[PDB]
PDB file of C-alpha atoms in Angstrom:
ATOM      1  CA  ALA V   1      -8.182   2.661  22.197  1.00 54.99           C
ATOM      2  CA  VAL V   2      -6.483   1.906  25.390  1.00 52.42           C
ATOM      3  CA  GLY V   3      -2.912   0.507  25.158  1.00 52.75           C
ATOM      4  CA  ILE V   4      -1.016   0.398  21.847  1.00 50.98           C
ATOM      5  CA  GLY V   5      -4.237   1.737  20.139  1.00 50.17           C
ATOM      6  CA  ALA V   6      -4.185   4.789  22.417  1.00 51.58           C
ATOM      7  CA  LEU V   7      -0.861   5.651  20.928  1.00 51.58           C
ATOM      8  CA  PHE V   8      -2.364   4.914  17.407  1.00 51.09           C
ATOM      9  CA  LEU V   9      -5.167   7.228  17.599  1.00 51.48           C
ATOM     10  CA  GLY V  10      -3.191   9.606  20.124  1.00 54.44           C
ATOM     11  CA  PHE V  11       0.629   9.589  19.947  1.00 55.92           C
ATOM     12  CA  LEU V  12       0.342   8.938  16.163  1.00 51.64           C
ATOM     13  CA  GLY V  13      -2.776  11.130  15.677  1.00 51.85           C
ATOM     14  CA  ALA V  14      -1.021  14.071  17.511  1.00 52.68           C
ATOM     15  CA  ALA V  15       1.845  13.468  14.730  1.00 48.91           C
ATOM     16  CA  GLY V  16      -0.774  13.614  12.198  1.00 50.29           C
ATOM     17  CA  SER V  17       0.806  16.758  10.682  1.00 51.74           C
ATOM     18  CA  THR V  18       0.323  15.128   7.095  1.00 52.65           C
ATOM     19  CA  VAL V  19      -3.126  15.209   5.393  1.00 53.87           C
ATOM     20  CA  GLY V  20      -2.418  11.415   5.280  1.00 51.66           C
ATOM     21  CA  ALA V  21      -3.714  11.054   9.018  1.00 51.44           C
ATOM     22  CA  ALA V  22      -6.625  11.377  11.301  1.00 50.04           C
ATOM     23  CA  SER V  23      -6.162  15.311  11.529  1.00 51.01           C
ATOM     24  CA  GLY V  24      -6.116  15.620   7.655  1.00 50.93           C
TER      25      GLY V  24
END
């Protein structure tokens, strides 16, 4: 994870406030 993938894991995963995400 570097560019967009760092947002994907990172920016999006920080917004993983749903069970339907990496934080679930």
